[PDB]
Amino acid sequence: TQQITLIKDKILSDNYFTLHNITYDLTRKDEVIRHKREVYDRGNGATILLYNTKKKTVVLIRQFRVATWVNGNESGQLIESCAGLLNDEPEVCIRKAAIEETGYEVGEVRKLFELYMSPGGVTELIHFFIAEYSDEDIEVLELPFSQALEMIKTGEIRDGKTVLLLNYLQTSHLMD
Amino acid sequence: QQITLIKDKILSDNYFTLHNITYDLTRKDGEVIRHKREVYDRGNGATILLYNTKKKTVVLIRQFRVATWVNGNESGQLIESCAGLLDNDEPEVCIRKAAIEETGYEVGEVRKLFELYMSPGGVTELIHFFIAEYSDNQRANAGGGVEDEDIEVLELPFSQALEMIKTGEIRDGKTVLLLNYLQTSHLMD
Ligand SMILES: [Cl-]
Numbered sequence: 449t450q451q452i453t454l455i456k457d458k459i460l461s462d463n464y465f466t467l468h469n470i471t472y473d474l475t476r477k478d479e480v481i482r483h484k485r486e487v488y489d490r491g492n493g494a495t496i497l498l499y500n501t502k503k504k505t506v507v508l509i510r511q512f513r514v515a516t517w518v519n520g521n522e523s524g525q526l527i528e529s530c531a532g533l534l535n536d537e538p539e540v541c542i543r544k545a546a547i548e549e550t551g552y553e554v555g556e557v558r559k560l561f562e563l564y565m566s567p568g569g570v571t572e573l574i575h576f577f578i579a580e581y582s583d584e585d586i587e588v589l590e591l592p593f594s595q596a597l598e599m600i601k602t603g604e605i606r607d608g609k610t611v612l613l614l615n616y617l618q619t620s621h622l623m624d
Numbered sequence: 625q626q627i628t629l630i631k632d633k634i635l636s637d638n639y640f641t642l643h644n645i646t647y648d649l650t651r652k653d654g655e656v657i658r659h660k661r662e663v664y665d666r667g668n669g670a671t672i673l674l675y676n677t678k679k680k681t682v683v684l685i686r687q688f689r690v691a692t693w694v695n696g697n698e699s700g701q702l703i704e705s706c707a708g709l710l711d712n713d714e715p716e717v718c719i720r721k722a723a724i725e726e727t728g729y730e731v732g733e734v735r736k737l738f739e740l741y742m743s744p745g746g747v748t749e750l751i752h753f754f755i756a757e758y759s760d761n762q763r764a765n766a767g768g769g770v771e772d773e774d775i776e777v778l779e780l781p782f783s784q785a786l787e788m789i790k791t792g793e794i795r796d797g798k799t800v801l802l803l804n805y806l807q808t809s810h811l812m813d
Pocket residue numbers: 522523627
């Protein structure tokens with residue numbers, strides 16, 4: 449792979465987000481192979497799990513996701529951690545989203561990592577955060593952390609980033 | 625919440641399909657609200673983490689990912705768990721095949737963990753997650769992927785894979801999910 453030379457970037461759709469057909473020469477460890485790859489750029493995002501160490505609860509959201517609705521999610525409804533697309537800086541973005549989606553204006557946030565979520569053909573990078581909490585088309589779900597972790601096992605929670613956050617919180621010992 | 629499809633426009637359909645979907649969603653109170661969303665359908669896939677309890681190692685892979693290269697990954701190389709699109713195979717048949725094709729290991733027993741939507745804002749993709757123990761005597765070839773692919777196979781201490789999440793050397797959603805599931809399982813203690 450090491451040597452990469454861009455040959456062509458063709459826009460297949462710029463309706464709002466952008467789909468590309470990208471051609472690049474790749475030099476195999478062994479030999480020059482020309483790859484043609486479809487790449488979808490819907491920009492980057494951030495997500496945040498809200499947790500309360502006193503009550504032992506977490507705050508998640510439930511909303512209709514049409515992309516799950518066309519792909520085996522019968523009602524389209526999906527339980528997720530609070531998230532939003534980023535022009536804002538990650539921490540600026542996620543503080544907006546927290547107020548706008550959950551109603552909590554949160555103090556200190558803790559950043560976990562930045563992960564590409566679907567690198568086969570989508571650019572999307574997600575900024576992951578957690579925050580303590582106190583005091584739309586989106587339902588705010590407050591639930592016991594113990595119930596949320598169990599919802600991962602039954603398949604009631606079936607969102608990538610949401611599982612990643614909940615597992616981090618579990619491994620952090622913050623709720624112990 | 626009543627949902628009704630109004631219009632499904634095909635924006636692109638070379639092999640995978642990009643849609644622009646207009647839909648009506650009924651609120652609490654009974655009010656119908658029209659929305660429009662782009663939906664990218666690349667189909668579903670499966671992924672597997674291979675682990676070895678004697679050597680305390682995992683097998684991962686490294687390949688060029690253009691989607692990351694255009695978005696902050698300087699070399700475009702990404703460390704990932706072995707994975708492939710279902711491609712009209714059932715998840716376990718898919719993942720057993722991808723494991724030998726990409727890593728060279730022919731695996732025995734697998735454990736299904738969960739099935740997760742990875743990017744549900746505008747991407748259809750559901751990923752079936754697997755783990756399996758591997759043994760050195762189960763390696764029939766060097767792997768490397770198929771067709772135009774150039775996949776590098778990585779075998780490393782599990783504790784070093786975990787270390788790499790913190791340093792950003794591993795920064796792939798499905799891979800971190802698996803490494804963390806393995807950490808929590810105690811299988812590697
Ligand atoms: Cl329906």
